Design a protein around this ligand. Structure first.
Ligand SMILES: [Zn+2]
Length: 178
DNA sequence: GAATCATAAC
Protein backbone atom coordinates (compact mmCIF):
# COMPACT_ATOMS: atom_id res chain seq x y z
CA UNK A 1 0.00 0.00 0.00
CA UNK A 2 0.89 3.63 -0.03
CA UNK A 3 0.25 3.21 -3.73
CA UNK A 4 -2.20 5.81 -5.03
CA UNK A 5 -4.46 3.08 -6.36
CA UNK A 6 -5.02 2.00 -2.75
CA UNK A 7 -6.08 5.50 -1.68
CA UNK A 8 -9.78 4.81 -1.21
CA UNK A 9 -9.03 1.81 0.99
CA UNK A 10 -7.06 3.96 3.39
CA UNK A 11 -9.70 6.64 3.33
CA UNK A 12 -12.46 4.21 4.20
CA UNK A 13 -10.58 3.26 7.38
CA UNK A 14 -10.20 6.87 8.56
CA UNK A 15 -13.15 7.74 10.86
CA UNK A 16 -12.91 11.44 9.98
CA UNK A 17 -13.55 10.69 6.30
CA UNK A 18 -16.47 8.41 7.06
CA UNK A 19 -19.67 10.24 6.15
CA UNK A 20 -21.82 7.18 6.71
CA UNK A 21 -21.32 3.63 7.96
CA UNK A 22 -23.18 0.36 8.53
CA UNK A 23 -22.37 -3.37 8.73
CA UNK A 24 -22.14 -3.72 4.91
CA UNK A 25 -20.80 -0.44 3.51
CA UNK A 26 -19.16 2.89 4.19
CA UNK A 27 -19.63 6.22 2.45
CA UNK A 28 -16.95 8.87 1.96
CA UNK A 29 -16.72 12.22 0.21
CA UNK A 30 -14.86 12.08 -3.10
CA UNK A 31 -11.50 13.74 -2.39
CA UNK A 32 -11.57 15.48 -5.78
CA UNK A 33 -15.30 16.01 -6.30
CA UNK A 34 -16.65 16.47 -9.84
CA UNK A 35 -19.73 18.27 -8.48
CA UNK A 36 -21.05 20.10 -5.42
CA UNK A 37 -22.16 16.74 -4.04
CA UNK A 38 -20.00 13.73 -4.82
CA UNK A 39 -19.80 10.63 -2.64
CA UNK A 40 -18.35 7.17 -3.00
CA UNK A 41 -20.07 4.10 -1.59
CA UNK A 42 -17.76 1.22 -0.71
CA UNK A 43 -18.45 -2.30 0.56
CA UNK A 44 -16.47 -3.56 3.57
CA UNK A 45 -16.01 -6.85 1.78
CA UNK A 46 -13.13 -6.38 -0.60
CA UNK A 47 -14.19 -6.54 -4.20
CA UNK A 48 -11.57 -5.76 -6.79
CA UNK A 49 -13.55 -4.97 -9.91
CA UNK A 50 -16.97 -5.28 -11.53
CA UNK A 51 -15.56 -8.09 -13.69
CA UNK A 52 -15.69 -10.06 -10.44
CA UNK A 53 -19.46 -9.69 -9.93
CA UNK A 54 -21.84 -12.59 -9.43
CA UNK A 55 -25.34 -12.89 -7.95
CA UNK A 56 -23.90 -13.38 -4.49
CA UNK A 57 -23.12 -9.67 -4.58
CA UNK A 58 -26.63 -8.80 -5.79
CA UNK A 59 -28.11 -7.89 -2.42
CA UNK A 60 -24.94 -5.96 -1.64
CA UNK A 61 -25.35 -3.91 -4.81
CA UNK A 62 -28.94 -3.15 -3.90
CA UNK A 63 -27.81 -2.14 -0.45
CA UNK A 64 -25.23 0.20 -1.93
CA UNK A 65 -27.92 1.74 -4.07
CA UNK A 66 -30.22 2.21 -1.11
CA UNK A 67 -27.56 3.75 1.07
CA UNK A 68 -26.69 6.10 -1.76
CA UNK A 69 -30.20 7.49 -1.90
CA UNK A 70 -30.36 7.83 1.85
CA UNK A 71 -27.15 9.89 1.82
CA UNK A 72 -28.75 12.30 -0.61
CA UNK A 73 -31.80 12.79 1.56
CA UNK A 74 -29.60 13.17 4.61
CA UNK A 75 -27.08 15.61 3.16
CA UNK A 76 -28.79 17.19 0.14
CA UNK A 77 -32.50 17.03 1.01
CA UNK A 78 -32.52 20.79 1.12
CA UNK A 79 -30.98 20.61 -2.38
CA UNK A 80 -33.10 20.91 -5.55
CA UNK A 81 -30.30 19.04 -7.37
CA UNK A 82 -30.71 15.94 -9.51
CA UNK A 83 -28.56 12.96 -8.58
CA UNK A 84 -27.18 10.03 -10.52
CA UNK A 85 -25.80 6.80 -9.10
CA UNK A 86 -23.49 4.53 -11.05
CA UNK A 87 -20.12 2.95 -11.75
CA UNK A 88 -17.27 3.70 -14.12
CA UNK A 89 -16.77 1.03 -16.77
CA UNK A 90 -12.99 1.10 -16.38
CA UNK A 91 -11.90 2.12 -12.89
CA UNK A 92 -8.48 3.52 -12.06
CA UNK A 93 -8.67 2.99 -8.30
CA UNK A 94 -8.77 -0.48 -6.77
CA UNK A 95 -11.83 -1.56 -4.75
CA UNK A 96 -15.28 -1.14 -6.37
CA UNK A 97 -17.01 2.17 -5.68
CA UNK A 98 -20.49 3.51 -6.38
CA UNK A 99 -20.50 7.13 -7.54
CA UNK A 100 -23.25 9.21 -6.01
CA UNK A 101 -23.08 12.50 -7.87
CA UNK A 102 -25.15 15.65 -8.22
CA UNK A 103 -25.87 16.68 -11.79
CA UNK A 104 -24.69 20.26 -11.44
CA UNK A 105 -21.06 19.25 -12.12
CA UNK A 106 -20.10 22.57 -10.57
CA UNK A 107 -16.58 21.90 -9.32
CA UNK A 108 -13.00 23.04 -9.96
CA UNK A 109 -11.89 19.39 -9.94
CA UNK A 110 -13.80 18.75 -13.14
CA UNK A 111 -10.81 19.68 -15.31
CA UNK A 112 -10.78 17.68 -18.56
CA UNK A 113 -12.70 15.82 -21.23
CA UNK A 114 -12.05 12.46 -19.54
CA UNK A 115 -13.84 13.58 -16.38
CA UNK A 116 -16.87 14.94 -18.19
CA UNK A 117 -17.16 11.92 -20.46
CA UNK A 118 -16.65 9.56 -17.54
CA UNK A 119 -19.82 10.95 -16.08
CA UNK A 120 -21.89 11.77 -19.16
CA UNK A 121 -21.62 8.82 -21.53
CA UNK A 122 -22.31 5.08 -21.51
CA UNK A 123 -19.01 4.84 -19.63
CA UNK A 124 -21.15 5.72 -16.63
CA UNK A 125 -23.14 2.52 -15.93
CA UNK A 126 -26.18 3.43 -13.85
CA UNK A 127 -26.50 1.39 -10.66
CA UNK A 128 -30.04 0.33 -11.52
CA UNK A 129 -28.96 -1.06 -14.89
CA UNK A 130 -26.13 -2.92 -13.19
CA UNK A 131 -28.45 -4.46 -10.64
CA UNK A 132 -30.94 -5.65 -13.23
CA UNK A 133 -28.00 -6.90 -15.27
CA UNK A 134 -26.85 -9.13 -12.42
CA UNK A 135 -30.40 -10.27 -11.65
CA UNK A 136 -30.97 -11.29 -15.27
CA UNK A 137 -27.51 -12.56 -16.24
CA UNK A 138 -25.65 -13.03 -12.94
CA UNK A 139 -22.86 -11.04 -14.57
CA UNK A 140 -21.98 -7.48 -15.55
CA UNK A 141 -22.13 -6.76 -19.28
CA UNK A 142 -19.64 -4.16 -20.45
CA UNK A 143 -19.84 -3.11 -24.09
CA UNK A 144 -16.49 -2.62 -25.79
CA UNK A 145 -15.38 0.82 -26.93
CA UNK A 146 -15.20 2.29 -23.47
CA UNK A 147 -11.81 4.06 -23.71
CA UNK A 148 -12.88 5.85 -26.90
CA UNK A 149 -16.05 7.18 -25.24
CA UNK A 150 -13.69 9.25 -23.09
CA UNK A 151 -12.51 11.08 -26.22
CA UNK A 152 -15.94 12.19 -27.55
CA UNK A 153 -16.65 15.92 -28.13
CA UNK A 154 -18.01 17.79 -25.10
CA UNK A 155 -21.82 17.85 -24.96
CA UNK A 156 -24.14 19.37 -22.35
CA UNK A 157 -26.15 16.83 -20.35
CA UNK A 158 -28.88 19.48 -20.00
CA UNK A 159 -29.45 21.18 -23.37
CA UNK A 160 -27.55 18.58 -25.49
CA UNK A 161 -25.57 21.37 -27.12
CA UNK A 162 -22.02 20.83 -28.32
CA UNK A 163 -19.17 22.69 -26.56
CA UNK A 164 -15.57 23.08 -27.81
CA UNK A 165 -13.69 23.15 -24.48
CA UNK A 166 -13.98 22.62 -20.72
CA UNK A 167 -13.85 26.34 -19.81
CA UNK A 168 -16.64 27.01 -22.30
CA UNK A 169 -18.64 24.02 -21.08
CA UNK A 170 -18.38 25.30 -17.51
CA UNK A 171 -19.41 28.80 -18.53
CA UNK A 172 -22.35 27.20 -20.31
CA UNK A 173 -23.39 25.12 -17.30
CA UNK A 174 -23.27 28.19 -15.06
CA UNK A 175 -26.53 29.40 -16.57
CA UNK A 176 -28.38 26.12 -16.09
CA UNK A 177 -28.08 26.66 -12.30
CA UNK A 178 -30.84 29.17 -12.25
C1' DG B 1 -1.99 33.16 -25.44
C1' DA B 2 -5.06 29.59 -24.05
C1' DA B 3 -6.48 24.92 -23.93
C1' DT B 4 -5.49 20.36 -24.86
C1' DC B 5 -2.62 16.37 -25.13
C1' DA B 6 1.21 13.08 -24.06
C1' DT B 7 3.98 11.29 -20.81
C1' DA B 8 6.50 10.68 -16.35
C1' DA B 9 6.30 10.52 -11.48
C1' DC B 10 12.94 7.81 -8.34
ZN1 LIG C 1 -26.89 23.18 -21.71
Amino acid sequence: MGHWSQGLKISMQDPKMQVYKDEQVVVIKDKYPKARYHWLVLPWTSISSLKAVAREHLELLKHMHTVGEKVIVDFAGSSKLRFRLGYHAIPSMSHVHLHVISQDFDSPCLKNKKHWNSFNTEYFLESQAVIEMVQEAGRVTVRDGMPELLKLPLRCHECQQLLPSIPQLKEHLRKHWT
